[model samples]
Target: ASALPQGNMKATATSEHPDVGNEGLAKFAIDGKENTIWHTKYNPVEELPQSITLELGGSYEINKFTYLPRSGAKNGNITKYELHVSEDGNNFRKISEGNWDDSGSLKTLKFNSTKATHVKLVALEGVGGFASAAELNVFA
Candidate 1:
């Protein structure tokens, strides 16, 4: 596997998987534990956007991002989702947006970039059921 650049971050996987066979998701562990998990029930006609800010300590380039969807969760009619990036963590610019028909098992999407420190995810359309985000992996 190719190594991610400096300031690399990854989301931890859910704990519901088989203990022996399952390799838990990647995440930043604090005090020997992983924190920061996003899970929300789907609400149609309402957009939910989650923002994550990263301070590189200095200027660094972002290459790609990966998202792992919850397993067997109702997608709630989510049609599309947008990914935004920012340099100063104030003004944001759309880096990429992906459309989905329904939620399913583990899925990964990647966005290639040259630079960014702040990233946001906006859920455009939802099915009114539920959606879970297991992890968000960023590579610089």
Candidate 2:
């Protein structure tokens, strides 16, 4: 917590819904663009408790996270969530959990600085029983 927040960390997610031209891939969540989004498979209409596991290239002391909902769409706005963190990818401890506003605006969550190489956002509840994000940011 002594140093300033670092530049947006590069990350990779576990899964993303296949969309035309790869518009809904997981990489889009950290692609630094608000237009693109990472959406869960919707053909079968993904159920509740969809998650986005992000692997940051390196570990850092992270204290804040932000979630941005997709533009012009409200289908997957996370209402309840749990944030987990891990220094090693194998073991994860939930660091935070709460409900966010059901809107298209940005949602922010702050916690005590902790070292983490992996960060996971579990959507316990969504507006329309789906999960999606335009961007997921971590600040160290």
Candidate 3:
């Protein structure tokens, strides 16, 4: 990791839920908007187990990702989370998982260089009622 982090190479993104908040959309998380948010409407069980995934056009040496959660209240958190990577998109393997920190809006996940076509953020627990973020930066 010598160079600075950048966005995925010509990638497309999708989530388990799409535009539940309707303020923008899940795609807006990567759509370069500090004003928009990617959020889940509190339905389908209210908590524990929500996810978002990205398909990087192809494989590269991916190292880290930062999730900028939407600020405050039920709008802003996940308690237990994990990052998963996959080459085929069907069989996902866990890269990392843990209790997220309480310091800031930006939560980060870093690991050794892994080859993959898809990256996933799995929210396994809840700090509030919704799993959300302002932006997600998956870097190579």
Candidate 4:
């Protein structure tokens, strides 16, 4: 019915661009704050296909996933993505894949109901060969 609350979730990313301290951390994406974000490495620039994995803490029948781009940044916005779900965290099944608008608005991907304890979002393509997320949310 409602989006799962951020309190029970944790986020981890394949890469995180170094920032002041917590701004670029994967945890920021699920922190429920739009001003902070999770960004990939930029020093060496982590190539495409970067991913962010969210541990929902418990299994839920999720049918919707949301991705929000970095607040005012233009480069790391994800354009092409793939969503996967898994109950064990090790074995994930791709549930959806598609292109999203290259803008700062929230992007949602909806699929048939599925139960998952973890969700991974793979960035196949983005604005500058990097990926970033201001926030991530899932709904049952």
Candidate 5:
């Protein structure tokens, strides 16, 4: 058997860039002209799916995923979110599911899996306001 590693990875919102609180939010470019990877945008009344590819190099089990919702929607709520994983980024499989009742909060989804090269997050629904994701943390 192989031994597991101990550490946690997290991303959080800072004072400089706060979460947008409403739908039809402005489309802000996350990546600059010099950068090539790590880009995101906000789309209102539409499901936004984001993908992240990481090279674990060795096999590592995924423990959980944490999401911090942005504040300021007219309704100020989130309905559902899903996490998916794929070995080659071509084919994806659902790993975990979560539902939220309000915004301006933090949530975590736990799943047991070994070695994935790609991870995808799908925001299913948002109510009373637009759904926004401030940051995502993956633990192994």
Candidate 6:
């Protein structure tokens, strides 16, 4: 089986302009496709602090995850971010975070297998209120 799990989750954002099932919604980032992406949209006065939380259906021993910027796009590289995890979705604890240097590279973070049902990806700074991501991969 593939090391990553693609089901049993829901996605949400801090500022979704076009709405889910539409372009730039939070779902696009987790849609398991490289061509698609999620953005906070151009409607924000400033789109920094863009975030997406994956509400996994149940707790799992999570060890690794990946983040990739929008395909063929030079913007929204997400230079700074924070990763958090939770069991009840309300209270979250910091996992790991860093400043990514590449725009399209598959950035992966590996840590001790932490039990959690929810994981959050926060983009502290986008290239231009863009905060785009091709995919968010999570695995045990």
TM-scores of the candidates in the order shown: 0.57, 0.88, 0.77, 0.95, 0.56, 0.89
Rank list by TM-score? 4, 6, 2, 3, 1, 5
Which digits, one per residue and each the tens of the lDDT, describe model 3 over residues 1-140? 43223354332333334554433355666666665665654445345566777777677678988887665544546667889999877889999999986443678788998888888878776555556666777777
Among all windows of 10 consecutive residues in model 1, the one with the lowest summed lDDT is: 14-23
lDDT of 2 by residue, 1-140 (tens): 33222234444444467866535777778877888888877776767777887777787889988899988879778899999998998899999999888989999888998999889998888878877899888878
Clashes of each: 8, 0, 0, 1, 4, 0
lDDT pick, better of 1 and 5: 1
Please give the distance, in angstroms, between residue 7's alpha carbon in candidate 4 and its true position after superposition: 1.6
Model 1, residue 128: displacement in angstroms? Answer: 2.1
Candidate 5 lDDT at 104 equals 55
Top candidate when judged by TM-score against the true structure: 4
Q: What local lDDT score does residue 121 receive in model 5, on the 0 to 100 scale?
A: 60
Model 6 regions lying over 4 Å from their true place: 1-4, 19-22
- Residue pairs of candidate 4 with colliding backbone atoms: 17-40
- Relative to the unseen true structure, what is the C-alpha lDDT of residue 83 in candidate 4, on a scale of 0 to 100? 98
What is the per-residue lDDT of model 1 for residues 1-140, given as tens digits with 9 covering 90 to 100?
A: 23243244433222211222222222321112212234442222123443333344444567666555544545432346776777876787888787775655333446565576555555655445333344555566
lDDT of prediction 3: 0.66
lDDT, each prediction:
0.46, 0.80, 0.66, 0.89, 0.44, 0.78
The TM-score, computed over Cα atoms with residue i paired to residue i, of candidate 3 is 0.77
At residue 38, candidate 4 shows an lDDT of 88
* Worst window of 10 by summed lDDT in candidate 3: 3-12
Tens-digit per-residue lDDT, 1-140, candidate 4: 57899889988889987676656888889988898888888877889889999999898999999998887776779999999999998999999998988999989888999999999999999988888888899998
